[PDB]
From Swiss-Prot, chains A, B:
GO biological process, one term: chromosome condensation
Top-level taxon of the source organism: Bacteria
Keyword Secreted: no
GO CC annotation terms, alphabetical: cytosol
MF GO annotations: DNA binding; structural constituent of chromatin
Record function comment: Histone-like DNA-binding protein which is capable of wrapping DNA to stabilize it, and thus to prevent its denaturation under extreme environmental conditions.
Key words of the record: DNA condensation, DNA-binding
Family that this chain belongs to: Belongs to the bacterial histone-like protein family.
Name under which the protein is recorded: DNA-binding protein HU
Length: 67, 67
């Protein structure tokens, strides 16, 4: 799946306009990038953590769902 | 930063209600998790790709921004 398909799937599931999903997705990605640029960690419970080269550490729950 | 702080930062930047940002963020995480559970790749231009254990490969743009 690419970014466009991700936006369409999320807009359908949440009952949201694609333009609002794109704004919020882009703002999420910009916020995570800015945090990593300052050396901060972005820890999302039930998914994983982004830290700094950028690295992603999957959470227990994600690993179990993908296992 | 944790998930709550991420939601608050994105809601301020996008001028969106925190409940709407949480709904869209959770739906994005659920959508990525479901794709990975089916063995699909989630490739987001200008950020990176999630693929399958779950792995994240940072994009060129993200690597340049955090170097």
């Amino acid at each position: 799946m690419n970014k466009k398909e991700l936006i369409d799937r999320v807009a359908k599931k949440a009952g949201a306009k694609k333009k609002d999903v794109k704004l919020i997705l882009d703002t999420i990605l910009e916020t995570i990038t800015e945090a990593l640029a300052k050396g901060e960690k972005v820890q999302i419970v039930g998914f994983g953590s982004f830290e700094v080269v950028p690295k992603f550490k999957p959470g227990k729950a994600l690993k179990e769902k993908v296992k």
